[PDB]
Each structure stands twice: as structure tokens, then as C-alpha cells.
Paper text:
We determined the structure of a 1.6 MDa mitochondrial F1Fo ATP synthase dimer by single-particle electron cryo-microscopy. The best-defined region of the assembly includes subunit a, the c-ring interface and ASA 6, which was built de novo. Two prominent aqueous channels defined by subunit a and the 10-subunit c-ring rotor conduct protons to protonate and deprotonate a c-subunit glutamate in the middle of the membrane. At aGlu288 about 20 Å below the lumenal membrane surface, the channel narrows to 4 by 5 Å and changes direction by 90° towards the c-ring. The positively charged, strictly conserved aArg239 in H5 separates the lumenal and matrix channels, preventing proton leakage.
Mitochondrial ATP synthase uses the energy of the electrochemical proton gradient across the inner mitochondrial membrane to produce ATP from ADP and phosphate by rotary catalysis. ATP synthases consist of the catalytic F1 head and the Fo subcomplex in the membrane. A conserved glutamate (cGlu111 in Polytomella) serves as the c-subunit proton-binding site.
Author numbering:
A (entry chain N): 71 to 151
B (entry chain M): 96 to 323
C (entry chain A), D (entry chain J), E (entry chain I), F (entry chain H), G (entry chain G), H (entry chain F), ...: 54 to 126
Write the structure that this text describes.
């Protein structure tokens, strides 16, 4: 964990503690605490549903500069002997 | 010397698929002759007075996703649920689709009346009916994004605000008759709210690309000497 | 205070306009599917026409919810 | 003050005209899609006819919201 | 003053006639598009027949708003 | 005077019959256009049948506005 | 005198049956036009069947206005 | 005497069942005409089936007016 | 005695279920006629299926008039 | 006793859900007949699918009459 | 106690959402039958798609009865 | 306390928008089945278009239940 990443660590963990404390001090608190165990139940389920080796080769085909391989210079018309 | 970017990384390939999609929504008009090496000074100039619609959409699409994606991150709430952000991008497309109309005419406000004959009291109501159907193009574009992130979120409180009551009024061991069927109902709305949040942006920005792309109609200025 | 009371009845009655808006963009999105049935070789134009009509149907949906918040707030 | 009270009930009841306006420009924009299904070679005329009928359907939508603001303001 | 009060309720109820007028000139302008689907070689006659029926449908729209202003003014 | 008051509420409620009259002569004039789509070589008979059915649909439109003026005047 | 008062509210509510009667003889007279589209060589039988169904639809229109005058007079 | 008063409101509300009965035997008599469009060589069987369904639709029309006179008389 | 009064209002409101029952066995008996249009060589099976669905539609008609007499008697 | 009074009004209003249930299994049993029109050689599968959908439509009919007896009894 | 009284009126009015849910899964199960009319050689996919849409239509039926028990209990 | 009373009547009246939402995604999911009838060789695009329109129909369903909880809570 580099210097730049640790600032993004407790710049996103101290966001949680700023905000998960902001869920208890509100009015409907247990309406909002059970809201977030349910909302992260799809963060779990999306991890084990999508095929990451098939989304990646879909986004590898998303751009024509990386999907189709290069055809710039054939090896004939480039030799010198 | 910012960063050595990888050549084929994932947000490089994800972004330029999006940008070549929105740029593909308003392509330039096929010109009135074969594109020579002398028509090129009118092709780079008709691609100059063209409004750069490809980045004005991707600005309003890589924001509306990344703001509504936070509505499905845990503990967080999407900033588009406020009225002060959702219609902050609602008027400012209808602003932008008006500034072009106030630029293709040269003036700063036209809108006056041209006369007619016997249907002239008939044609007097319609252009200030088109105006009130042009003014409500703004409010329609804003609140539509504001509700869909407050509609699936005011309900989803109360689905949580009832489903808890069955393990509250009844015991924790009593999940078998009803709770497991209801906890499957509640979870099946964040599955709905995911597909609304990914797609409300894709609606919102394709509306922006239609509502601007009816203003940048231009013409070529290379007919000066054809055959010689 | 019947002024702030009787606007709550017409609050709910105002949103019945959003019944037929729901029924409107059902047949509108029904014939999208029957429209792609005849020639799915070119149907991006038809969905490119389908997001036109949905945007003008939300210009009835929001056009009725302009009144509901005008009654409430 | 039932004068400024009872107009709030008929405020919401006035906008139920915008139900069938929503259902009207659904089938109107439904058959746009089935209309482009038969011959998408020429369909700019049909969308050029579709923006005609939407403008005359908003001459029912605004024609009912002429009454709503006449009741309120 | 229930005389000037109760006419405000029937004011909004009178405009519900403009629901089906909106639904009327939707299918009327729907089949305009399906009508130009069969033979767009000659369709200026059909739009020349479409502005006939819209004018006689506004002879229901104004024919109901004749009553609304008769109740109000 | 609730006698001359409560007839103003049922005044507006009486004209909601003119919703579906508007929706009635929409599909009636919709299929006029789809009717001329199949054979516009002979369609003066069909419009000669279309003014038959409109006259019998105004025998519902006026047949409901017979009641509205019976309530008012 | 709520007896002669409350019958005036149900007077207007009774005539909402004449909404769908209007919508009924619209599609009934719509398919008259699409019926003459297929074979206008013989269509006097179809109009000879169309005045049958209109007479049995006015046996719903008058069948509801039997109640309205029973409430009033 | 709200007993003999409040039955007059539900008197008119009871006859709204005769809306969709009117809309029912419209499409029922609409497809009679489209039914004779396909083969008018044999259509006395179809009208012989059409008077079957009208008699069973008046077994909804009278089946609702059984209630109206039960409320009144 | 609002107990025996207010059940008379919901008496008439209960029978509005018999609107769409009437509209239900219209299209149900409409497609009987279009069903005999395709092959009247064998249509006693179709009418033998048509009296099935009418009996299950009267299991909605009586299923709503079970409530009306439960309110009255 | 408005508690046992006002539930009688919402008793009748609760059964209006059984309008569109009646209209639902009309078109559901309409297309049964048009479904047997295309191929009556194999239609026991289609009626074997028709009793599936009627059972799931009575899971709306009883699903609304679950509420009516919950209000009454 | 109008608090526990007036929720009984909106109890019955809340279930009118289950009208069009009934009408929704009628045409949804109507076109199941017309869908098996075109190719009953492969129709287990279509019924495999029909139980998809019924489950998402009961996500409107229960989605309205979520409100009814929220009003009652 | 008519303020917290009269919002319970417009609570139930607000959800009648979810009638035609139910009827909207019935024909929307009806033509899904007729859409797979023409070419089930490629129908994952059509269901890939069907989950588009359902998500925009729930942008009417939740768009009306945004108002109901705004009235209640």
C-alpha cells in the first residue's frame, strides 16, 4: 500500500465511519441500517455471478484499436538483402 | 508526464467504446460531392461549427452513472436524489440546447411574430404553445432523473420498514413461514434499482443528444469551382 | 383547516393521469417488440425512435406530476 | 374559505384528462414503430408525420392544463 | 356561498371528456402512420383526410370546453 | 341553496360520457384511414359510411349533453 | 331536503354509462369502415348489419337514460 | 330519511355496469362485421351466432338492472 | 342510521365489477366469431369451448354479486 | 358506529378489482378461440395451457376477495 | 375515531390497482395462446417465458397489496 | 384532525395509477410472446429489449408510489 493509496484508504474508510454513524443518528435508523446490509447483499451476489473472463473480453472487443490486431507492415516489402 | 498508461486497460477500452457510441449518435451529413483533397477544408470546417456533442453527452453520462452508482454502494446515498443536483443537470442541458439556438441566428433573443392572413389568430396560439412545450422540455429532463432515484428509495425504506416487523413482532427463529419469502422480495428491488440506475443515465443522455442534435444543422462551403 | 385538508384528496386524484401514461408506454413498448419482429436486421433506428416517444410520454408523466407538487408544495 | 378550498379538489380532478392524453400518444407512438416495420427505407416522412400528431396531442395536454392554472391562478 | 363553490368541483369533472378526446386523436393519428405504411406514394390525400378528422375531433374538444367556461364564466 | 349548488358538481360529472365518445370516434376514424389503405380506388363509399357512423356517434355526444343542459337549464 | 338534493349527484353519475356506449359505437362504426375496405362491391349488407348493431347499442344508451329520468322525473 | 335518500346515490352508481355492457356488445357487433368480411357467402350462421351472444350480453345488462330496481322498488 | 344508509352507496359501487365482466365476455364472444371465420367446418368444438369460458366468466359475475347481496341482505 | 359503517363503502369499492379480472380472462379466453383457429389438430395443449392461465387469473380474483372478507369478517 | 374509520374507505380504493393487473395478465395470457398458435412445435420456451411475465405481474399485484395491509395492519 | 384523515382517502386514490401500469406491462409482455412467435431463433435481443421497457414501466409504477409515500410519510 503506497502513500497515495493509504490516503484513499482512510479517505474511504473514514467516509464510512462518518456515514455509518450518520445512519444511526437519523430518525428512521433501523430502517436505514437494514437498508445497507440488504444493499450490499448484491455486492456479494454480483461478485459470484458475472463471468469476469467474459466481461473482460467483451470490453476488449469494445474498442477497435484493441480488439482487431494490427496490420500495419507485412514482412514482405520490408526486407533488405 | 502524468502516468504511463497501459495500452489496452479496462477504463481505456470502456471509455472509448462509450465515446464512439455517443459520437455515433449525431454523425455528420454525407456531403454533396465526392470527398476530394479539395473538399477537406469544408469538412474540417463543417466539423468546426458542429457542436461537440460527443463530449457533452459523455460528461452527462460518466457523471449520472457515477453519481447513481453510489446509490447501490453500501452506506452511501446517491447525490442525484437531491433536487439541487438532479435538475442542476436538467436545466443545464436545456440551457445548452438554447444557447446554440441563440447562436445560429446571431441575435441574443429572437421570437417575434411573422404575419399571416385568415389563420393568423390560429397561428398566434401555436408558437406560444410551442414555447410552453419547449419550456417544459427542461422540467421533464430534470425531474425525471430526480424521481427515479427518490422513487426507488422512498419505497425501499418502507419495504425495509415492514419486513423488519415480522422478526420484530415475532421471534428470530420464526424466519421460516414468511420472512425468507419477504427478504427475497426486498432484495429483488435492489436488483430492480440497479437496472434503473444504469439505465436512467442512458435515457438521460440520449435525451440530451436528441435535444441538442436538432440545432447544429449546417452546410458546406466548398462549391466554389467544380470542374476547373 | 379544510384548505390543507382537501388538497390531500385531490392529491391522490391528480395522479390517476399516471394510469394511462403507464398504459400508454406499454403498447408503445409492446409494438417495439413487434417492430423488431419484422426486421431485427435494422432495429437500432426503431429503438432510436422508441426513446423519442418515451421522452414525449414522460412529457405527460411529469406534465401531470407538475400539478401534484403544485397542489402539495 | 371553501372558495379557495374546494378548487383544490377540482384541481386534481382536472388533470385526469392527462391520463388518456398519455394513452393517446402511446398508441400514436406505438404505430410509429409498427409503421417503420413495414418500410424503414422511407420513414422520415412517417416521423415527419409523427411530430405533427404529437403537436396536436399536446394541443389536448396543454388544452387541459389551460384549465388547471385557470382554477389555481 | 356554495353556489360559487360547488361549480369548482364540476369544473374539473367537466374536463374528463378531454381524456377520450386525447385517446381519440391518438388512434386517429396512429392509423395515419399505418395508413402511410401501405402506400406513401400517395399520402397527401390521407393527411388531407387527417386534418379533416382532427378538426371534427376538436369539435368534441371545444364542444366540452364550451361547458367548462359556461360553468366558470 | 344546495339545490342550485350540488347540480354544479354533477354538471361536470355528466360530461365524462364525452370522454369515450372522443375515444369512440378516434378508432372509428382510425380505421377509416386503414380502410383507405387497402383500396383507395373506391373509398368514397367508406367515407360515405364514415359520415354515417359519426352522425350516430354524435347521437351519443348530444345524447349526453341532453342531460347536462337538463341539469343546468 | 336532501331527498331532492342527493338525486342530483347520482343524476350525473348515472350518465357515465353513456361514456362506453360512445366508445362502443365508435369501434362498431370503425370496423364498418375497415369492413368496407375489404370488399366495397358488397357493403350494403354490412351497413344493413351496421344499423342492426347501432339499434342494439341504443338499447344500452336509452337503457341507461331509462334510469336517469327515473331518478329525476 | 337518509334511508330513502342514500339509495338514490347508489341508484346511479349501480348503472355504471351498463357502460362496459355497451362497450361489450360493440366489439361483439364489431367483429360481426369483420366476420362477414371474410366470407359473406355463409354469414347467416354468424348472425345466428350473433343473436346468441347478444342474448347472453343482455344477461349482464338485465343482470345489473335487477339490482337497480331492487334498490329503488 | 348511517349503518343501513352507507351500505347503499357501496351497494352500487360493488356492481362496477360487472362492467369489465361485460367487456370480458364481449371479446370472449368476439373471437368466437373470428374463430368460426377460419374453419366453420369444425366449430362445435369452439362453441363447446365457448360455453366453458362463459361459465367461468359467470364465476366472476356471480362472484361479485356474492358481495352485493352480502352487503344488502 | 362509523367503524362498522364505513367498511361497507370500501366493501363495494374493493370488488372493482374484479372488473379487470373479468376483462382479463375474456381476452385470455378470446385468444384461446383464435389459438384453435390456426391449428385445431393440436389444441388440447392450448386448452391445457388455458387452464393454467385461468388458475393464475383466479389467483387475482380470490386475491382481491381475500381483502373483501378481511374487511367484512 | 375518524383515523381508524377513514382508512377503511381508502382500503377498498387501494385495491382498484388490481383491476388492471387482472386485465394485464389477461392479454399476457391471451397472446400465450396466440403464441402457441403459430408454432406449437416449440412452445415450452414460450410458457417458460410466460411464467416469467406472470411473476413480474405479481410484482405489481403484491406491490399494491403491500399498501393495503400497510393501511390496515 | 381531518388533515391526517383526508390524506387516507387520497392515499388509496393515488394507487389507481397502478391499474394501467399493470395493464401496460401486460400488452408489453403480451407482444413479447407474439414477438418470439415470429422468430425464436433470435429472441434474446427481444427479451433484452423487454427488460428495457419493463424498467421504464417501473419508472411509472414507482413514479406513482413516489406520491403515495409522500402523502403518508
Amino acid at each position: 500500500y503506497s502513500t497515495q493509496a493509504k490516503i484513499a484508504l482512510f479517505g474511504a474508510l473514514s467516509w464510512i465511519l462518518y456515514r455509518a454513524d450518520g445512519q444511526s443518528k437519523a430518525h428512521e435508523w433501523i430502517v436505514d441500517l437494514n437498508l445497507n446490509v440488504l444493499q450490499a447483499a448484491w455486492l456479494i451476489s454480483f461478485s459470484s455471478l458475472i463471468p469476469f473472463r467474459a466481461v473482460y473480453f467483451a470490453f476488449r472487443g469494445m474498442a477497435p484499436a484493441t480488439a482487431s490486431t494490427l496490420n500495419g507492415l507485412k514482412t514482405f516489402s520490408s526486407i533488405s538483402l | 508526464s502524468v502516468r504511463d498508461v497501459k495500452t489496452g486497460s479496462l477504463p481505456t477500452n470502456f471509455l472509448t467504446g462509450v465515446y464512439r457510441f455517443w459520437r455515433s449518435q449525431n454523425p455528420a451529413e454525407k456531403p454533396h460531392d465526392p470527398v476530394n483533397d479539395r473538399l477537406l477544408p469544408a469538412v474540417v470546417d463543417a466539423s468546426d461549427k458542429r457542436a461537440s456533442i460527443g463530449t457533452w453527452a459523455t460528461t452527462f453520462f460518466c457523471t449520472i452513472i457515477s453519481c447513481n452508482l453510489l446509490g447501490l454502494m453500501p452506506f452511501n446515498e446517491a447525490p442525484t436524489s437531491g433536487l439541487g443536483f438532479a435538475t442542476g443537470l436538467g436545466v443545464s442541458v436545456w440551457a445548452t440546447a438554447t444557447i446554440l439556438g441563440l447562436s445560429k441566428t446571431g441575435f441574443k433573443f429572437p421570437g417575434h411574430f411573422i404575419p399571416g392572413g385568415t389563420p393568423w389568430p390560429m397561428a398566434f396560439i401555436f408558437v406560444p404553445l410551442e414555447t410552453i412545450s419547449y419550456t417544459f422540455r427542461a422540467v421533464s429532463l430534470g425531474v425525471r432523473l430526480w424521481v427515479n432515484m427518490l422513487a426507488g428509495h422512498t419505497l425501499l425504506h418502507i419495504l425495509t420498514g415492514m419486513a423488519l416487523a415480522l422478526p420484530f413482532s415475532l421471534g428470530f427463529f420464526s424466519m421460516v413461514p414468511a420472512t425468507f419469502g419477504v427478504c427475497c422480495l426486498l432484495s429483488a428491488l435492489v436488483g430492480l434499482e440497479y437496472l434503473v440506475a444504469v439505465l436512467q443515465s442512458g435515457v438521460f443522455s440520449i435525451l440530451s443528444t436528441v435535444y441538442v442534435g436538432e440545432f447544429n444543422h449546417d452546410k458546406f462551403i466548398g462549391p466554389a469551382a467544380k470542374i476547373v | 383547516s379544510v384548505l390543507a385538508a382537501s388538497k390531500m384528496v385531490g392529491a391522490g386524484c391528480a395522479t390517476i393521469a399516471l394510469a394511462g401514461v403507464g398504459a400508454g408506454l406499454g403498447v408503445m413498448f409492446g409494438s417495439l417488440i413487434n417492430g423488431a419482429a419484422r426486421n431485427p436486421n435494422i432495429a437500432k433506428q426503431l429503438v432510436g425512435y422508441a426513446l423519442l416517444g418515451f421522452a414525449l410520454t414522460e412529457s405527460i408523466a411529469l406534465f401531470s406530476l407538475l400539478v401534484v407538487f403544485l397542489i402539495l408544495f
